[PDB]
Design a protein around this ligand. Sequence first.
Ligand code: PAI
Length: 284
Amino acid sequence: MKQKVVSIGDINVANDLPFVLFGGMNVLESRDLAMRICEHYVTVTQKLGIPYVFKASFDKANRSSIHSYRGPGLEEGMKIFQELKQTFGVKIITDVHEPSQAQPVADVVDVIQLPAFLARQTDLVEAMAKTGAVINVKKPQFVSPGQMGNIVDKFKEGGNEKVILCDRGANFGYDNLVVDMLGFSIMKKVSGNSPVIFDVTHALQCRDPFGAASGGRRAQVAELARAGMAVGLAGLFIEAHPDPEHAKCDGPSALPLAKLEPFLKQMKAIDDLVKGFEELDTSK
Ligand SMILES: O=P(O)(O)CN(CC(O)O)C[C@@H](O)[C@@H](O)[C@H](O)[C@H](O)COP(=O)(O)O
């Protein structure tokens, strides 16, 4: 069949419609810190005719505590969207954490998210259901692709239907992740041909590192982000920062802000012909 299409503005994501770019950075460090990041992405998109949605997060939840750089916080967090927002009128995306706030957030932003850890959590699947917006599903590293119909079905069961599926790799042995480029279709099928998007950033982090033959970071984001692209996805997901990030030079992994352009050009040419190629198959 053809692929379902959740429409994010003049941007329409679809497994046959060009790899939409879902850029951003990690923890929302500073109202203007971001600009460097918005502005610099914004450009490259249009220069290369890649669509753009901006990824941004406002809270802690994950890692260091009691406050340990807990993120801008809701109240003053949402404010900062509205600036990058109109400054270039942009489609943004924020992960929520606990139900209540599944309405505030769902205002200044375009593509709300449901963090891996509360994936199969129901009451947030609902608290967003009581919204009807564009949701992004963070596919847990412990779930078989085949289990994505049990996050989607129920979303629709929540009234909300406008769903998206994001893959962050899956775990492989203690502390390490991997991706099976063969898990993208399986997710397509089990999930009403919903768009399938690759979080190239979180994904390979524990991947680059498999201690011994690694033990000091190092990066290969495009190298892996081209695999996604040559299988045929809806689009990518990446986070950047000048010198890597404050929340990615220690958190997970990231991408050099101004190295970003020829990355996409790799991802545009590669995608280019793949989204071209007239549908084939080898089950006969
Ligand atoms: O399983 P998840 O992706 O929800 C959590 N992990 C998976 C991993 O590779 O350890 C991903 C990120 O959320 C985590 O790396 C980040 O470092 C954390 O959220 C924030 O870090 P920081 O800004 O320095 O306070």
